Amino acid sequence: DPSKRLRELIIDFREPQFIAYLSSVLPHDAKDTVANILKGLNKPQRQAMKRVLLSKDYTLIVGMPGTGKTTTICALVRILSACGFSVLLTSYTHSAVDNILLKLAKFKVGFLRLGQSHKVHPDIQKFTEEEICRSRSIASLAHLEELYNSHPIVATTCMGINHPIFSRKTFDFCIVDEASQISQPVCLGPLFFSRRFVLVGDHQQLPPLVVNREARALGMSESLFKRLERNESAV
Amino acid sequence: GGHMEPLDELDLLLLEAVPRVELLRKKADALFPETVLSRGVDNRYLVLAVETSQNERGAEEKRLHVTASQDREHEVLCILRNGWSSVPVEPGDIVHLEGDCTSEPWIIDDDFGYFILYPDMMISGTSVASSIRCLRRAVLSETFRGSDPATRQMLIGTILHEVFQKAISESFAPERLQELALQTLREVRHLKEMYRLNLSQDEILCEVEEYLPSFSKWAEDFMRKGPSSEFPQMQLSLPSDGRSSPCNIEVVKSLDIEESIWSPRFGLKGKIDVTVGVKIHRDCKMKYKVMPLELKTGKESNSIEHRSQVVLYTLLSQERREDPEAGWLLYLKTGQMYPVPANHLDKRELLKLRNWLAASLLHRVSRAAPGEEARLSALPQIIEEEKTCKYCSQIGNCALYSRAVEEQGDDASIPEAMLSKIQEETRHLQLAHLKYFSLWCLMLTLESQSKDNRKTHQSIWLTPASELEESGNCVGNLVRTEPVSRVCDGQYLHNFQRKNGPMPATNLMAGDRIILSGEERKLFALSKGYVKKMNKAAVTCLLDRNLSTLPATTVFRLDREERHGDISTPLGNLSKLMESTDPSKRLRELIIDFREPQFIAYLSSVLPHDAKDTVANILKGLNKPQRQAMKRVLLSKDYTLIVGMPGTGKTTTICALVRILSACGFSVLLTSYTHSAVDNILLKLAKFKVGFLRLGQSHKVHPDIQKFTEEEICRSRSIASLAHLEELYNSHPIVATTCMGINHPIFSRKTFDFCIVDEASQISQPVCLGPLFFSRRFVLVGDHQQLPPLVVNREARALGMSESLFKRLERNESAVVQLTVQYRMNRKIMSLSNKLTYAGKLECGSDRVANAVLALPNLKDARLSLQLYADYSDSPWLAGVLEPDNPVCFLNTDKVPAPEQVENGGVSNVTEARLIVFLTSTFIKAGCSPSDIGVIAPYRQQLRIISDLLARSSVGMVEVNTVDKYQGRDKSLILVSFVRSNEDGTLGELLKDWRRLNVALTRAKHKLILLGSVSSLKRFPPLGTLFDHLNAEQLILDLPSREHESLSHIL
DNA sequence: ACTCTGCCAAGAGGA
Ligand SMILES: Nc1ncnc2c1ncn2[C@@H]1O[C@H](COP(=O)(O)OP(=O)(O)O)[C@@H](O)[C@H]1O
Ligand SMILES: Nc1ncnc2c1ncn2[C@@H]1O[C@H](COP(=O)(O)OP(=O)(O)O)[C@@H](O)[C@H]1O
Ligand code: SF4
Ligand SMILES: [Ca+2]
Ligand SMILES: [Ca+2]
């Protein structure tokens, strides 16, 4: 069923659904915390949070240059976390994902970072599986599990989808930063592990790089963000 | 009976008397005890005779002789015709007639009347409905109740039922429905099932949402306000007119939600989803009927099963209101609503089918002749229909039961394709496995079917609350005026005052399972629940239903839910043990085939390096046997048996093991049978700042452990999302629950490195199995010299049912570690059980423990105060009793006439009672805190006597209890009234038990006083042996005659 | 021949 649903949304362009706003959209006890986050945001930013909360499928956030992509994703992650959702946070590059995490660290939001620690920002390294294992002498299956379950927010790159965690966990949401720069079948990867998803991108900026002329002629630089953009109601 | 050899035998063996009536009255009693036979609406008739014959027309008919008096005054001839002739009724059965006989050759046939076999067995309508396609499936469903597992479709269904039920009170406006869906999806009860099933929260919300427009279409058609011709036209022909002319159906309102009904008229029970007020419009005219509505999610089938359920609901309704004559089936998927008329033919066939189910559920034990060995009875035959069996969720148990228990003696008869299917299903099992499963099913059934687990609800629906108020278990003349507050739906707090002379004179403690009825017969079995507070003015209960629909005018009655002998958990455990998975195979091999548990030799690398120091610090605190127990566990590949002899610090030892395992990074499932045992370990672990999660209902849990429960954390932290619930379940490697709590969703998703079972030697063996399915290795803590699991049935006990799992595994000596250092008893008290029971193995943990004596600061003064009553100056017995340097003392009552009183199968001794009450006063006056004193007696009846006399002497606060209620506990001073004292020599079986005595002799820290008749008691092997040891050190002191000055003021 | 603690429960669909 998860693959069928993705084929229908991505291949057959089935219209993504959204409900009308109601008091009960967010768990009652989260409402105030979310309000305080929203107040900090500008109107388009708030409108992006709203669209995500109302979605049944996906949301496309167009981050035009200088609009504070990392601020906006950080804020969304805070809202989702306050709501008690689990979140899979991804991008193609290490430093993009790490940029969001630096902000989230400042807000004392917990997350686990997967990946080899030498590829990771120095101030994010202490949050990695690798460093926590070394630092805490993890040497038992139950302690390893404990680490994997310790944060609803799990952060990795798009290519990191072979981690054992993805054989065992699914997420309420996946967020993909830089979705308009990522090769469409690479962008698919995290999407198998979440119910709903959010792509952040800008098709007026650089597309995935495709070196072969014939492949480019066939459509290979159409990012997943771009493909989904005909569904205006998600944008 | 007798086997004849000459012709004289044949002549004299000819019988005929009337004593066959008693043979059946006893038989009826064995399964429906204390059933008062009567005439009228709730008639009860005992069957005396049954004969099949040919009718005036050449066809089969059954005739019965019945009576509605315990007296042999009436014999009524009842005749059962057509289909009714095949009712499997036997002489000795309790029956009820729908239509009590007014005429004297009473006929029940295809056209008129119902015959109800065992009216007091209330069978759920859904079981009856499911028995249509297969009787055997229905019986298997009723017995192995957790073999139809929770599905995704079933969760959807549950949620949608709740949304519809919230909506029909409020509104079906789309925005309100969406609201209700959003809120319902976050309820923990639903989140738990999503977790169980590993589903995504929003996926389930989406599925629920797809249905909402159908909810609105339905309400649009049936609940719109408008012209009566605008409601949907149907044909709905009821016995009430003369009809057969289409009419318009309007649903006015819901009158009720989730209405549960017990029917002692039909032997039925059920839950009506929604009770509706309906207007039936026809030719400008209107009729209003109150009708049952059944909600169904999934396929719109209008099936025989579905329709039959509704028909049964219209029967159930007659117990509350007038016959609705029909009900409604609503398929929520499409909003389609189908009328279900309840014809005589349908009710007839359905109640015939209910009789067969009642019969098959009741006749579980076969007996070759009366007094030969018990066997399990065959289930109803495996059926011919391939299609039915293929889709059947009970196939595992069906094949299992076929192969283990009923396996053909001469004739198979089973369909060949089904026959080889049995083979496929059961081929993984060995002979010993089949035998074990079969033996434990029989013993469990015997124990389940025992007379104490058999009492009926008759007393509630027949005798007024007036009669049982002078008994200890019922209260009547109750009322409510206050608003009904709610904790979470399924819990509703109700306040009940007396509005009359305040009647709390009843035996009913808080946390007691109770059944609320109205005193009006038409308001029987309104709600189950427990009692929270028990004031002298009022009584407050948490009940599953909101009873504000009822007028303030109604008068209520409280009645206790008695032990019906539920065995579904242990049966479930046995079934699970027979499954073809590696974890089950490994348990069969260890438990059934006694495969030797393995252990490695110790090495540096046994524990993770970084844990070694932390573990060392824990070990240093322990004594040598304790350390040795930790070591055995760490070296095991299978299990470990820790023998916790009395006073050896069971809870200290388990706490320490849990710390070691936790430091090592293992996950641990911590269990016992009782709440307070598990809670006792947790109190220690809390002090060591070790984290754990506690499962279970928070009101059953120790006050200082409540904050650690799932329930409190959910409330306290507003958990309202699947991910937050998961987070709570994963937050601690240590999970703590009772043995019966194995149905928690966590066990569908998690496994543990280790399971620890406290009190394993007190737990029924198939109950002890339950947690063991969820861990790789296990640890049982117990002592087979202490009390075994209680088994009330003699035959089951004879078959081996009190062998605990701890005991069974003990032949594997290499797994056994004995805790022998004890911190309870002084050298003299310990010495006693060391001689009687523990073969010298117990040691005092210190000089302080060894040399401790009863602290009596005010002895001189208390001693002097006695002189007012009699001359105790130079009294052999009294000085001996009071002397702290005399820790063990036996008071022989032979010279004081101190006989027993026997009433109702229990035993008392007034004289013994007066003696301990005196002794207890003297000790309190001497400076012993009342909380440091425990009174034990073997017989439950004696305790009542002791309790009363202590109340009378202003000294009620000393604990008075049986041996069983002192398990694992101690007191400074223990006084034992060994009640038995008689001339004629009637011995119980109770005092024959070595373990019972052992537990009595080991509850005392400092002083132990024993009282009874040496000449009566010495006839019991444990006491005889006790007397040999007490004598060898002159510890038996003879009381004088009751006339003597030192006793006369007491006696 | 007398000793008693645990489970929420009838149905949530499947055809
Ligand atoms: N809602 C907002 N209100 C005020 N300032 C904002 C908002 N969103 C973004 N900004 C500003 O715009 C910049 C966004 O860039 P970004 O890459 O998100 O963060 P930074 O560059 O601070 O790491 C920030 O420096 C911040 O000052
Ligand atoms: N290894 C040990 N060293 C010293 N004292 C012990 C040891 N094990 C048990 N004890 C003592 O014996 C008693 C054991 O009883 P237990 O039920 O385990 O704990 P408590 O009664 O303190 O709750 C404790 O009071 C404790 O003082
Ligand atoms: S398998 Fe066939 S026979 Fe066995 S119970 Fe299920 S339906 Fe009845
Ligand atoms: Ca229903
Ligand atoms: Ca149902």
mmCIF file of N, CA, C and O in Angstrom, chain B residues 324-392:
data_model
loop_
_atom_site.group_PDB
_atom_site.id
_atom_site.type_symbol
_atom_site.label_atom_id
_atom_site.label_comp_id
_atom_site.label_asym_id
_atom_site.label_seq_id
_atom_site.Cartn_x
_atom_site.Cartn_y
_atom_site.Cartn_z
ATOM 1 N N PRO B 324 -39.789 -4.838 20.465
ATOM 2 C CA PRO B 324 -39.745 -3.942 19.305
ATOM 3 C C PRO B 324 -40.179 -4.602 17.979
ATOM 4 O O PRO B 324 -40.481 -3.874 17.024
ATOM 5 N N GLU B 325 -40.201 -5.941 17.929
ATOM 6 C CA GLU B 325 -40.677 -6.727 16.767
ATOM 7 C C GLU B 325 -39.727 -6.764 15.564
ATOM 8 O O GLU B 325 -39.882 -7.591 14.654
ATOM 9 N N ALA B 326 -38.754 -5.861 15.560
ATOM 10 C CA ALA B 326 -37.793 -5.724 14.463
ATOM 11 C C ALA B 326 -36.678 -4.808 14.924
ATOM 12 O O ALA B 326 -36.834 -4.069 15.912
ATOM 13 N N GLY B 327 -35.562 -4.856 14.213
ATOM 14 C CA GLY B 327 -34.467 -3.937 14.477
ATOM 15 C C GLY B 327 -33.883 -3.445 13.172
ATOM 16 O O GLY B 327 -34.443 -3.711 12.084
ATOM 17 N N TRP B 328 -32.742 -2.760 13.274
ATOM 18 C CA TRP B 328 -32.115 -2.156 12.114
ATOM 19 C C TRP B 328 -30.629 -2.488 12.002
ATOM 20 O O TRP B 328 -29.909 -2.514 13.010
ATOM 21 N N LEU B 329 -30.203 -2.744 10.764
ATOM 22 C CA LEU B 329 -28.810 -2.932 10.392
ATOM 23 C C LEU B 329 -28.384 -1.753 9.558
ATOM 24 O O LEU B 329 -28.910 -1.558 8.447
ATOM 25 N N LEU B 330 -27.409 -1.005 10.048
ATOM 26 C CA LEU B 330 -26.837 0.067 9.275
ATOM 27 C C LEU B 330 -25.385 -0.275 8.883
ATOM 28 O O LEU B 330 -24.519 -0.527 9.751
ATOM 29 N N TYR B 331 -25.143 -0.303 7.576
ATOM 30 C CA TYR B 331 -23.814 -0.428 7.032
ATOM 31 C C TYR B 331 -23.267 0.985 6.872
ATOM 32 O O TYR B 331 -23.642 1.726 5.957
ATOM 33 N N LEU B 332 -22.402 1.369 7.805
ATOM 34 C CA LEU B 332 -21.826 2.725 7.834
ATOM 35 C C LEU B 332 -21.018 3.116 6.578
ATOM 36 O O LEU B 332 -20.910 4.293 6.271
ATOM 37 N N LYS B 333 -20.506 2.129 5.847
ATOM 38 C CA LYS B 333 -19.678 2.363 4.657
ATOM 39 C C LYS B 333 -20.442 3.101 3.610
ATOM 40 O O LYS B 333 -19.876 3.925 2.915
ATOM 41 N N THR B 334 -21.747 2.839 3.545
ATOM 42 C CA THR B 334 -22.598 3.342 2.469
ATOM 43 C C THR B 334 -23.774 4.093 2.993
ATOM 44 O O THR B 334 -24.456 4.753 2.228
ATOM 45 N N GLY B 335 -24.034 3.987 4.288
ATOM 46 C CA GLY B 335 -25.188 4.665 4.882
ATOM 47 C C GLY B 335 -26.501 3.927 4.658
ATOM 48 O O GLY B 335 -27.545 4.475 4.923
ATOM 49 N N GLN B 336 -26.437 2.677 4.202
ATOM 50 C CA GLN B 336 -27.602 1.853 3.902
ATOM 51 C C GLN B 336 -28.127 1.195 5.156
ATOM 52 O O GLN B 336 -27.359 0.529 5.870
ATOM 53 N N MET B 337 -29.433 1.339 5.399
ATOM 54 C CA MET B 337 -30.064 0.753 6.572
ATOM 55 C C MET B 337 -31.165 -0.243 6.202
ATOM 56 O O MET B 337 -32.110 0.111 5.512
ATOM 57 N N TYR B 338 -31.043 -1.467 6.715
ATOM 58 C CA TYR B 338 -31.909 -2.589 6.378
ATOM 59 C C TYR B 338 -32.814 -2.916 7.536
ATOM 60 O O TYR B 338 -32.365 -3.024 8.674
ATOM 61 N N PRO B 339 -34.115 -3.051 7.260
ATOM 62 C CA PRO B 339 -34.992 -3.514 8.330
ATOM 63 C C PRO B 339 -34.745 -4.991 8.626
ATOM 64 O O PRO B 339 -34.512 -5.778 7.706
ATOM 65 N N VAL B 340 -34.768 -5.366 9.899
ATOM 66 C CA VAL B 340 -34.732 -6.790 10.242
ATOM 67 C C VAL B 340 -35.943 -7.141 11.096
ATOM 68 O O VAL B 340 -35.949 -6.854 12.292
ATOM 69 N N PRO B 341 -36.985 -7.733 10.468
ATOM 70 C CA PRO B 341 -38.139 -8.217 11.216
ATOM 71 C C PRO B 341 -37.760 -9.484 11.959
ATOM 72 O O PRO B 341 -36.995 -10.318 11.445
ATOM 73 N N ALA B 342 -38.288 -9.607 13.168
ATOM 74 C CA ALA B 342 -38.004 -10.737 13.997
ATOM 75 C C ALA B 342 -39.181 -11.687 13.939
ATOM 76 O O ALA B 342 -40.091 -11.591 14.749
ATOM 77 N N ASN B 343 -39.165 -12.601 12.970
ATOM 78 C CA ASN B 343 -40.254 -13.585 12.810
ATOM 79 C C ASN B 343 -40.160 -14.696 13.816
ATOM 80 O O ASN B 343 -39.079 -14.970 14.358
ATOM 81 N N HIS B 344 -41.285 -15.368 14.045
ATOM 82 C CA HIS B 344 -41.292 -16.502 14.956
ATOM 83 C C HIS B 344 -40.341 -17.613 14.534
ATOM 84 O O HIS B 344 -39.659 -18.168 15.376
ATOM 85 N N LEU B 345 -40.276 -17.898 13.232
ATOM 86 C CA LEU B 345 -39.361 -18.907 12.669
ATOM 87 C C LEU B 345 -37.878 -18.640 13.017
ATOM 88 O O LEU B 345 -37.159 -19.553 13.437
ATOM 89 N N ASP B 346 -37.457 -17.389 12.847
ATOM 90 C CA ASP B 346 -36.094 -16.943 13.143
ATOM 91 C C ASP B 346 -35.736 -17.086 14.621
ATOM 92 O O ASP B 346 -34.701 -17.658 14.952
ATOM 93 N N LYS B 347 -36.597 -16.578 15.497
ATOM 94 C CA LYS B 347 -36.377 -16.662 16.933
ATOM 95 C C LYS B 347 -36.392 -18.122 17.373
ATOM 96 O O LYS B 347 -35.624 -18.524 18.245
ATOM 97 N N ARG B 348 -37.268 -18.917 16.767
ATOM 98 C CA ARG B 348 -37.328 -20.314 17.082
ATOM 99 C C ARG B 348 -35.989 -20.983 16.736
ATOM 100 O O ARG B 348 -35.362 -21.571 17.615
ATOM 101 N N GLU B 349 -35.529 -20.857 15.489
ATOM 102 C CA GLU B 349 -34.323 -21.564 15.063
ATOM 103 C C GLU B 349 -33.092 -21.079 15.823
ATOM 104 O O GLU B 349 -32.224 -21.870 16.193
ATOM 105 N N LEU B 350 -33.050 -19.782 16.081
ATOM 106 C CA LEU B 350 -31.953 -19.179 16.806
ATOM 107 C C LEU B 350 -31.867 -19.639 18.270
ATOM 108 O O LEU B 350 -30.762 -19.828 18.794
ATOM 109 N N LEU B 351 -33.016 -19.825 18.913
ATOM 110 C CA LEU B 351 -33.027 -20.283 20.295
ATOM 111 C C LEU B 351 -32.771 -21.790 20.425
ATOM 112 O O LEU B 351 -32.168 -22.233 21.418
ATOM 113 N N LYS B 352 -33.200 -22.562 19.419
ATOM 114 C CA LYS B 352 -32.785 -23.960 19.270
ATOM 115 C C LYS B 352 -31.259 -24.032 19.163
ATOM 116 O O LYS B 352 -30.601 -24.785 19.895
ATOM 117 N N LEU B 353 -30.697 -23.213 18.277
ATOM 118 C CA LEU B 353 -29.250 -23.161 18.103
ATOM 119 C C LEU B 353 -28.504 -22.672 19.349
ATOM 120 O O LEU B 353 -27.385 -23.130 19.616
ATOM 121 N N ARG B 354 -29.116 -21.769 20.113
ATOM 122 C CA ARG B 354 -28.549 -21.359 21.389
ATOM 123 C C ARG B 354 -28.486 -22.502 22.429
ATOM 124 O O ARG B 354 -27.518 -22.590 23.195
ATOM 125 N N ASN B 355 -29.504 -23.368 22.448
ATOM 126 C CA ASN B 355 -29.509 -24.562 23.300
ATOM 127 C C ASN B 355 -28.306 -25.481 23.017
ATOM 128 O O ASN B 355 -27.567 -25.833 23.949
ATOM 129 N N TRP B 356 -28.091 -25.839 21.750
ATOM 130 C CA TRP B 356 -26.903 -26.597 21.347
ATOM 131 C C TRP B 356 -25.580 -25.976 21.796
ATOM 132 O O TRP B 356 -24.669 -26.684 22.236
ATOM 133 N N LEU B 357 -25.473 -24.660 21.714
ATOM 134 C CA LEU B 357 -24.265 -23.994 22.162
ATOM 135 C C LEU B 357 -24.124 -24.057 23.681
ATOM 136 O O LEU B 357 -23.026 -24.260 24.182
ATOM 137 N N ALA B 358 -25.235 -23.890 24.396
ATOM 138 C CA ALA B 358 -25.225 -23.961 25.870
ATOM 139 C C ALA B 358 -24.835 -25.376 26.326
ATOM 140 O O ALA B 358 -23.989 -25.540 27.198
ATOM 141 N N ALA B 359 -25.424 -26.379 25.681
ATOM 142 C CA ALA B 359 -25.098 -27.782 25.928
ATOM 143 C C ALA B 359 -23.613 -28.082 25.691
ATOM 144 O O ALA B 359 -22.971 -28.662 26.556
ATOM 145 N N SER B 360 -23.065 -27.663 24.553
ATOM 146 C CA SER B 360 -21.663 -27.940 24.215
ATOM 147 C C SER B 360 -20.713 -27.209 25.140
ATOM 148 O O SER B 360 -19.664 -27.750 25.490
ATOM 149 N N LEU B 361 -21.076 -25.992 25.548
ATOM 150 C CA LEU B 361 -20.245 -25.264 26.503
ATOM 151 C C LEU B 361 -20.277 -25.910 27.883
ATOM 152 O O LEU B 361 -19.285 -25.860 28.607
ATOM 153 N N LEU B 362 -21.395 -26.542 28.235
ATOM 154 C CA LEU B 362 -21.542 -27.049 29.592
ATOM 155 C C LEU B 362 -20.983 -28.452 29.792
ATOM 156 O O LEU B 362 -20.396 -28.739 30.819
ATOM 157 N N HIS B 363 -21.155 -29.311 28.801
ATOM 158 C CA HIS B 363 -20.735 -30.687 28.907
ATOM 159 C C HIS B 363 -19.303 -30.857 28.428
ATOM 160 O O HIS B 363 -19.028 -31.348 27.333
ATOM 161 N N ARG B 364 -18.375 -30.415 29.260
ATOM 162 C CA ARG B 364 -16.982 -30.437 28.857
ATOM 163 C C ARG B 364 -16.203 -31.669 29.344
ATOM 164 O O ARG B 364 -15.209 -32.051 28.714
ATOM 165 N N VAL B 365 -16.678 -32.303 30.423
ATOM 166 C CA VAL B 365 -16.002 -33.474 31.000
ATOM 167 C C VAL B 365 -16.798 -34.789 30.854
ATOM 168 O O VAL B 365 -17.922 -34.908 31.340
ATOM 169 N N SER B 366 -16.199 -35.749 30.152
ATOM 170 C CA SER B 366 -16.755 -37.083 29.990
ATOM 171 C C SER B 366 -16.272 -37.976 31.103
ATOM 172 O O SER B 366 -15.130 -37.868 31.552
ATOM 173 N N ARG B 367 -17.150 -38.881 31.514
ATOM 174 C CA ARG B 367 -16.875 -39.822 32.569
ATOM 175 C C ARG B 367 -17.455 -41.191 32.163
ATOM 176 O O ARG B 367 -18.677 -41.348 32.136
ATOM 177 N N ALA B 368 -16.575 -42.152 31.837
ATOM 178 C CA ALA B 368 -16.944 -43.496 31.300
ATOM 179 C C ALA B 368 -18.083 -44.182 32.064
ATOM 180 O O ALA B 368 -19.077 -44.603 31.473
ATOM 181 N N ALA B 369 -17.912 -44.290 33.378
ATOM 182 C CA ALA B 369 -18.991 -44.611 34.312
ATOM 183 C C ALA B 369 -18.904 -43.581 35.461
ATOM 184 O O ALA B 369 -17.863 -42.911 35.600
ATOM 185 N N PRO B 370 -19.998 -43.408 36.253
ATOM 186 C CA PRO B 370 -19.909 -42.492 37.412
ATOM 187 C C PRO B 370 -18.865 -42.923 38.467
ATOM 188 O O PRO B 370 -19.123 -43.830 39.270
ATOM 189 N N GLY B 371 -17.693 -42.279 38.440
ATOM 190 C CA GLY B 371 -16.589 -42.597 39.364
ATOM 191 C C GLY B 371 -15.289 -43.062 38.720
ATOM 192 O O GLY B 371 -14.268 -43.204 39.407
ATOM 193 N N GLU B 372 -15.341 -43.316 37.408
ATOM 194 C CA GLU B 372 -14.162 -43.621 36.577
ATOM 195 C C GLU B 372 -13.477 -42.305 36.207
ATOM 196 O O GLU B 372 -14.053 -41.227 36.409
ATOM 197 N N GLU B 373 -12.273 -42.391 35.642
ATOM 198 C CA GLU B 373 -11.480 -41.198 35.333
ATOM 199 C C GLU B 373 -12.177 -40.220 34.382
ATOM 200 O O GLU B 373 -12.920 -40.609 33.475
ATOM 201 N N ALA B 374 -11.942 -38.943 34.650
ATOM 202 C CA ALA B 374 -12.413 -37.847 33.836
ATOM 203 C C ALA B 374 -11.650 -37.756 32.518
ATOM 204 O O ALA B 374 -10.438 -37.981 32.448
ATOM 205 N N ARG B 375 -12.393 -37.421 31.474
ATOM 206 C CA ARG B 375 -11.855 -37.222 30.145
ATOM 207 C C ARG B 375 -12.433 -35.912 29.654
ATOM 208 O O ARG B 375 -13.498 -35.509 30.108
ATOM 209 N N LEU B 376 -11.742 -35.232 28.742
ATOM 210 C CA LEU B 376 -12.371 -34.122 28.008
ATOM 211 C C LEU B 376 -13.364 -34.677 26.970
ATOM 212 O O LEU B 376 -13.058 -35.634 26.240
ATOM 213 N N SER B 377 -14.552 -34.082 26.928
ATOM 214 C CA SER B 377 -15.548 -34.380 25.907
ATOM 215 C C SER B 377 -15.148 -33.862 24.519
ATOM 216 O O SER B 377 -14.495 -32.820 24.402
ATOM 217 N N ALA B 378 -15.537 -34.600 23.477
ATOM 218 C CA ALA B 378 -15.383 -34.143 22.095
ATOM 219 C C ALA B 378 -16.095 -32.793 21.903
ATOM 220 O O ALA B 378 -17.103 -32.499 22.559
ATOM 221 N N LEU B 379 -15.574 -31.959 21.010
ATOM 222 C CA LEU B 379 -16.308 -30.764 20.626
ATOM 223 C C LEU B 379 -17.335 -31.153 19.576
ATOM 224 O O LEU B 379 -17.355 -32.309 19.159
ATOM 225 N N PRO B 380 -18.215 -30.210 19.163
ATOM 226 C CA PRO B 380 -19.059 -30.550 18.013
ATOM 227 C C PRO B 380 -18.185 -30.929 16.814
ATOM 228 O O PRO B 380 -17.056 -30.423 16.678
ATOM 229 N N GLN B 381 -18.682 -31.847 15.999
ATOM 230 C CA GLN B 381 -17.920 -32.370 14.872
ATOM 231 C C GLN B 381 -17.319 -31.275 13.976
ATOM 232 O O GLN B 381 -17.937 -30.236 13.753
ATOM 233 N N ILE B 382 -16.112 -31.530 13.478
ATOM 234 C CA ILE B 382 -15.580 -30.818 12.318
ATOM 235 C C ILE B 382 -16.592 -30.919 11.144
ATOM 236 O O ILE B 382 -17.122 -32.010 10.847
ATOM 237 N N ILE B 383 -16.869 -29.775 10.516
ATOM 238 C CA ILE B 383 -17.906 -29.657 9.474
ATOM 239 C C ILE B 383 -17.400 -30.035 8.080
ATOM 240 O O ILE B 383 -16.185 -30.132 7.852
ATOM 241 N N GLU B 384 -18.356 -30.240 7.172
ATOM 242 C CA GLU B 384 -18.110 -30.600 5.779
ATOM 243 C C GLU B 384 -17.633 -29.432 4.891
ATOM 244 O O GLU B 384 -16.863 -29.646 3.958
ATOM 245 N N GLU B 385 -18.078 -28.213 5.203
ATOM 246 C CA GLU B 385 -17.876 -27.012 4.359
ATOM 247 C C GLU B 385 -16.435 -26.474 4.324
ATOM 248 O O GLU B 385 -15.958 -25.860 5.285
ATOM 249 N N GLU B 386 -15.762 -26.716 3.196
ATOM 250 C CA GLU B 386 -14.387 -26.247 2.923
ATOM 251 C C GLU B 386 -14.241 -24.732 3.053
ATOM 252 O O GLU B 386 -13.328 -24.246 3.732
ATOM 253 N N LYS B 387 -15.160 -24.020 2.386
ATOM 254 C CA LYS B 387 -15.240 -22.558 2.346
ATOM 255 C C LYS B 387 -15.220 -21.944 3.749
ATOM 256 O O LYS B 387 -14.480 -20.983 3.985
ATOM 257 N N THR B 388 -16.018 -22.517 4.660
ATOM 258 C CA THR B 388 -16.114 -22.071 6.062
ATOM 259 C C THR B 388 -14.768 -22.235 6.807
ATOM 260 O O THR B 388 -14.271 -21.274 7.401
ATOM 261 N N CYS B 389 -14.188 -23.436 6.738
ATOM 262 C CA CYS B 389 -12.942 -23.785 7.429
ATOM 263 C C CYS B 389 -11.734 -22.965 6.988
ATOM 264 O O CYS B 389 -10.917 -22.552 7.823
ATOM 265 N N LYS B 390 -11.631 -22.743 5.678
ATOM 266 C CA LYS B 390 -10.561 -21.950 5.061
ATOM 267 C C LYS B 390 -10.464 -20.529 5.668
ATOM 268 O O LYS B 390 -9.368 -20.047 5.953
ATOM 269 N N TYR B 391 -11.621 -19.901 5.877
ATOM 270 C CA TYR B 391 -11.741 -18.557 6.448
ATOM 271 C C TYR B 391 -11.748 -18.522 7.993
ATOM 272 O O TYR B 391 -11.817 -17.437 8.585
ATOM 273 N N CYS B 392 -11.687 -19.695 8.635
ATOM 274 C CA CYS B 392 -11.839 -19.808 10.094
ATOM 275 C C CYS B 392 -10.569 -19.519 10.896
ATOM 276 O O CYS B 392 -9.533 -20.173 10.717
#
